[PDB]
Amino acid sequence: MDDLVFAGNKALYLVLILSGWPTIVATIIGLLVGLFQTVTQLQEQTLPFGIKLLGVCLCLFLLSGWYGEVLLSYGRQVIFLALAKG
Amino acid sequence: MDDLVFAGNKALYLVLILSGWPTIVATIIGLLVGLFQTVTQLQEQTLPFGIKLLGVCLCLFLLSGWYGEVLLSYGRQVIFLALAKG
Amino acid sequence: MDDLVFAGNKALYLVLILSGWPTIVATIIGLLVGLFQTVTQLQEQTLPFGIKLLGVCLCLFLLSGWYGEVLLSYGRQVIFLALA
Amino acid sequence: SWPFWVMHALGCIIDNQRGATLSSSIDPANGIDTSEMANFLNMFAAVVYLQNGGLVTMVDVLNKSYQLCDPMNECTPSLPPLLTFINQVAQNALVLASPVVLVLLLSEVFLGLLSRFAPQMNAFAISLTVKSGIAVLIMLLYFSPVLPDNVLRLSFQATGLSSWFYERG
Amino acid sequence: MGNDISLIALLAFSTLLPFIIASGTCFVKFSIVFVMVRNALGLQQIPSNMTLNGVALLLSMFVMWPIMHDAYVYFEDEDVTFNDISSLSKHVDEGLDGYRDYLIKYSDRELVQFFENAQLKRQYGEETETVKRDKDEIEKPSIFALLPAYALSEIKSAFKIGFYLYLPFVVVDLVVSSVLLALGMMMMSPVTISTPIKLVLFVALDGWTLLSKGLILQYMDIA
Amino acid sequence: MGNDISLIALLAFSTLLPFIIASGTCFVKFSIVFVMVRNALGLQQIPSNMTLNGVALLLSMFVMWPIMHDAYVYFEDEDVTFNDISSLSKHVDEGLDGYRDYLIKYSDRELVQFFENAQLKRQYGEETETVKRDKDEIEKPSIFALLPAYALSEIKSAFKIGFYLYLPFVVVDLVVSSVLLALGMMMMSPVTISTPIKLVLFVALDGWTLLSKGLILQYMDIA
Amino acid sequence: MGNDISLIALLAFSTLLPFIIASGTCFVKFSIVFVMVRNALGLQQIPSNMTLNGVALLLSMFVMWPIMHDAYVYFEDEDVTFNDISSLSKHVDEGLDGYRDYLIKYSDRELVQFFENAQLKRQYGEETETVKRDKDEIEKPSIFALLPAYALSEIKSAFKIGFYLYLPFVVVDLVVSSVLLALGMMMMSPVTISTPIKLVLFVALDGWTLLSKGLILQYMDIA
Amino acid sequence: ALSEIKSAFKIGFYLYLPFVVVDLVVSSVLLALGMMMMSPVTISTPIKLVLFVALDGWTLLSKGLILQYMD
Numbered sequence A, B: 001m002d003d004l005v006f007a008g009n010k011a012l013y014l015v016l017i018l019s020g021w022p023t024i025v026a027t028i029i030g031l032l033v034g035l036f037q038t039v040t041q042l043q044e045q046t047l048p049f050g051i052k053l054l055g056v057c058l059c060l061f062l063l064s065g066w067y068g069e070v071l072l073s074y075g076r077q078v079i080f081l082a083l084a085k086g
Numbered sequence C: 001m002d003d004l005v006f007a008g009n010k011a012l013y014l015v016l017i018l019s020g021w022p023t024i025v026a027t028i029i030g031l032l033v034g035l036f037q038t039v040t041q042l043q044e045q046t047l048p049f050g051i052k053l054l055g056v057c058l059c060l061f062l063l064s065g066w067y068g069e070v071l072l073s074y075g076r077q078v079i080f081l082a083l084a
Numbered sequence D: 001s002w003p004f005w006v007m008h009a010l011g012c013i014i015d016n017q018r019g020a021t022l023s024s025s026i027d028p029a030n031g032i033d034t035s036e037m038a039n040f041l042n043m044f045a046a047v048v049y050l051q052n053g054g055l056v057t058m059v060d061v062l063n064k065s066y067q068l069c070d071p072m073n074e075c076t077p078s079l080p081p082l083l084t085f086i087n088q089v090a091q092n093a094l095v096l097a098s099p100v101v102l103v104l105l106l107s108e109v110f111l112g113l114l115s116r117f118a119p120q121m122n123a124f125a126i127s128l129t130v131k132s133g134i135a136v137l138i139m140l141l142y143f144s145p146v147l148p149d150n151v152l153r154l155s156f157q158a159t160g161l162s163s164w165f166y167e168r169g
Numbered sequence E, F, G: 001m002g003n004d005i006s007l008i009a010l011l012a013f014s015t016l017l018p019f020i021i022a023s024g025t026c027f028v029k030f031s032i033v034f035v036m037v038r039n040a041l042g043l044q045q046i047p048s049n050m051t052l053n054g055v056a057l058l059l060s061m062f063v064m065w066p067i068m069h070d071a072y073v074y075f076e077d078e079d080v081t082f083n084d085i086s087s088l089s090k091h092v093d094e095g096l097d098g099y100r101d102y103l104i105k106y107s108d109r110e111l112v113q114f115f116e117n118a119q120l121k122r123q124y125g126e127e128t129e130t131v132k133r134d135k136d137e138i139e140k141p142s143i144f145a146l147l148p149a150y151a152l153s154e155i156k157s158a159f160k161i162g163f164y165l166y167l168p169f170v171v172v173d174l175v176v177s178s179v180l181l182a183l184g185m186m187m188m189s190p191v192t193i194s195t196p197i198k199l200v201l202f203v204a205l206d207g208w209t210l211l212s213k214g215l216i217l218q219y220m221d222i223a
Numbered sequence H: 001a002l003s004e005i006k007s008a009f010k011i012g013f014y015l016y017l018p019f020v021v022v023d024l025v026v027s028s029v030l031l032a033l034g035m036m037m038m039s040p041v042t043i044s045t046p047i048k049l050v051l052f053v054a055l056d057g058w059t060l061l062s063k064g065l066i067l068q069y070m071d
């Protein structure tokens, strides 16, 4: 039982960790560009998209490795919990 | 797995550069037409869209040959890697 | 594959033309009413929406005969290119 | 089925509030439109139920259904209680989902208020970046009560057969 | 042993049963109204199609099961005797009147009469229709004439009902939008606010219960 | 019973029956029309396909029955027994004329003739030319030519109808948006208001009765 | 029958027919093209797959029948009786050439040769060739080599045709979406309006006639 | 029969959890870019395949399933 609760909790915890950094940078870029467009009055609306695409892709390059190490370790763990009973 | 690493990273780099050019053109046009409305102090919704459409269509007429070269090259390359072991 | 290349280029050309006119009519109406607001000034947001609708509707009502002929010609042309 | 349909509804409400409209697909085994969260919570309920031995209560209620109302006596489901059923399921689901809907509403109004000082800020687009993280963060806190909430309080019991069925013969 | 043709008729009937139910029974109406109301509340997949179809099916049985049971009780009746194909046909037809009456009650006389003409009049060299005085034909429209005329009337009734249920939700949408504008809190999409409100309001008033009663009371008395 | 080969033929026919109904009968048209109407109203699950196809099948039965009855009576006739292959084959052929003549009214002449040209034995030069008199050519093209031309022409005529059905709803959908823009509520989705209007319009128009009647009138003649 | 083994072979072939039709006949092409048409029009349910496949099978019948007939007329001659294995084997072999021609007309020889060299174990299955030398390879190639090449060669062709058929409708979609942006009606989904335009466009082109004719003309030629 | 169904379902549950993570992550990054019209399944399917291949699932799984029946 507690193994079930633990594994289910951890799933949500990993979602949170992995998704957190891209969504942070997409937020910060959204705020900065929105402010800049009030500091100098320009009514463009694709500029956020153009910048935040580069912003998100860059950090996907950076974190490409840790993403695979975390998921491998988790998969091995849950396969053990499922099968290794005696 | 240097092969999986290569094919995975190149896919994302190709997305970033294939998509960048239209969005750059659209953004620069957007800014200039937004400015001109300010120095003229004259305002309407439709002029920027109208010009943006033409700008993107010209961008595609020009570059599209190179889009084909890049995609064919990648298409062959991945197949050869998949069936490389034999 | 000259035929395939041609078909492709023509597609974009057709979209650029067939969308062009209505956007020009809407642009000109919006601009002209905009300037007309600067004199005798009263500032209202909806007048461009009210009038451009009539502009575009009347444009389509006049030209819609043309559109079908252009489209038909293109469709026949590509069907033949394919089945040859 | 009653404990599972509530968790499925809960998951559908969350995935709708956080955007995510397009993610769903129709399950071929049942013909039901299934989101990403809904499938997860629907499995997780099943496993805790099986672990608690509900499987015994299922055969139990079956046997009792035969002892208390017999094929030859024309046993029939009661009409009056059946008429409430859909609304009790919807009630339970809403009552349980509410805490997340509230926080996500406050979040979006807060951003809209903030927009007043910087009218070029796309407060809508910002909310799409934020709300999915908020949703998972909050549900992670109120996650552990999910195990007791469903396992006992929602599971059907053999004692209820008396009210839902009677003999017409 | 029994009779080898009545055996064929039994097995055949049991294969067609779900299509009859799906096309000539109040299931047609119940399954539609629920799904419409679900769309109007603006949140698909709550309740599930499984829940809705299951309930609609159960309710349809209260209306229809007595009629079938009455028909079998009519046929299991050891005191009859026959002499000819006509005398048997009449008695078998008489057995179906219990169902025929239900279809006649819930369907349009003129569309029924139209199909009753259309089965024949490609045969006919004539325009006169009086040639049979009504009292037989008004009682005995054929079942194949009644079926599609019934289904086409059930659908229309369903739409009539659902129309009136849409109105209040529309009103609620207009109110929300007008408030956001009057506050100037413009750049927020109203749907995000109004779908919670619609849900909570309808559940807090038990719309589904009132709806279920209002549907059944066309066909039964619950007491 | 009878000639062993006639028995085989009867069973083969009855095995292929549903593909014929699905490919050479008005069922093709009615099936399409009802689904297009559902899409025009904008409903994704109401009514079920199992209801719509049931109605379409019943409506088709009226139109097709008289031909099946006439052909049956024509073959259940002891009049003759046959001396020769040519006498038998021309007796068989004369029984299908009722169906052949049904297909001829609706398939299109030019496509029919093209398919008949297609069947002839190939030649090394382009085929030797011919023109043939009406009693073959107008009266009696072969069924293996008529059948696909029929299917194709029916599909086309169905799409045509669907086109007209869409127009009034398109009008509604535009008008409602323009009025919401005139009121400034630019952010509200108009689907939430246009859908019920469409339903109201369809019930007040009583579209089901009109469609069901007129579709039959295209084939039957009723007075 | 005069030979028990001839009987066995005939029945076996009759049992394999549907897989040969589905893998070595123009049915492969015609089946695909119609489904792509339906997708490009954006229709989910209609027409039915068995309607489309029925038409595809009828059309393919015209194209393939001449070969079946030629082979039947060739084989039914008992005009010679056979001294030996090789005499029989050659007599049979020479009968398939009417089919072998048709496969070799449309497959692409570089595959055919690649497979030939593969089913033989030769030179460890693949080796380089210094010299390129063509050996009336048209008569050498086994049918078991020809069949896959034909299948792949013709699937590809179908995809090509479907590509060309999509373009006109894509134009319509982008045009509608642009004029709606010109009006500023940014909230409204084009699919409510663009569909009927596609329908009328296809009806005016009469795409079924042109399409069906051209498909046949690729294989036959007719006045 | 019901005991084996229970335990097989139990084992099957555990195996979902990585792929569930994959799916929710992909959906979040697409919404962060605003590409609401992209069906995630197209992107998430290959990530699942390569994940399972990297685990070597069938080896681990077929080993453990047999070791449960013999010491």
Ligand SMILES: CCCCCCCCCCCC[N+](C)(C)[O-]
Pocket: A060, A061, A063, A064, A067, B008, B009, B012, H025, H026, H029, H030, H033
């Ligand atoms: C629009 C992009 C959505 C991407 C969602 C998946 C993120 C992980 C991508 C794989 C790991 C990073 N990398 C660079 C190797 O691709």
Ligand SMILES: CCCCCCCCCCCC[N+](C)(C)[O-]
Pocket: A067, A068, A069, A071, A072, B001, B004, H022, H025, H026, H047, H050, H051, H054
């Ligand atoms: C969407 C989750 C993030 C992307 C990574 C998914 C796991 C891919 C497989 C990792 C393999 C790691 N590696 C190369 C060391 O084996």
Ligand SMILES: CCCCCCCCCCCC[N+](C)(C)[O-]
Pocket: A064, A065, A068, B004, B005, B008, B009, B011, B012, B015, H043, H047, H050
């Ligand atoms: C273009 C978006 C989707 C790209 C998906 C690429 C998947 C790469 C999987 C391996 C990632 C981990 N890595 C690089 C260590 O192997």
Ligand SMILES: CCCCCCCCCCCC[N+](C)(C)[O-]
Pocket: B064, B065, B066, B067, B068, B069, C004, C005, C008, C009, C011, C012, C015, G170, G171, G174
């Ligand atoms: C109206 C938009 C149409 C987009 C698709 C057009 C067809 C694909 C482009 C074909 C030509 C490719 N190219 C330029 C490399 O030859």
Ligand SMILES: CCCCCCCCCCCC[N+](C)(C)[O-]
Pocket: B060, B061, B062, B064, B065, B067, C008, C009, C010, C012, G174
């Ligand atoms: C608004 C149209 C969007 C089309 C997106 C794809 C663009 C690249 C491929 C089509 C290129 C067409 N071209 C320039 C060869 O004619």
Ligand SMILES: CCCCCCCCCCCC[N+](C)(C)[O-]
Pocket: C060, C064, C067, C068, C069, C071, G175, G176, G179, G197, G200, G201, G204
């Ligand atoms: C963009 C709105 C107007 C689109 C009009 C396009 C019509 C295409 C169909 C042409 C049919 C010509 N026809 C058959 C009426 O003569």
Ligand SMILES: CCCCCCCCCCCC[N+](C)(C)[O-]
Pocket: D075, D076, D077, E058, E061, E062, E063, E065, E066, E221, E222, E223
């Ligand atoms: C639920 C379908 C299977 C059982 C058949 C039920 C037949 C209807 C009985 C209704 C009795 C209602 N009552 C007591 C008010 O008459």
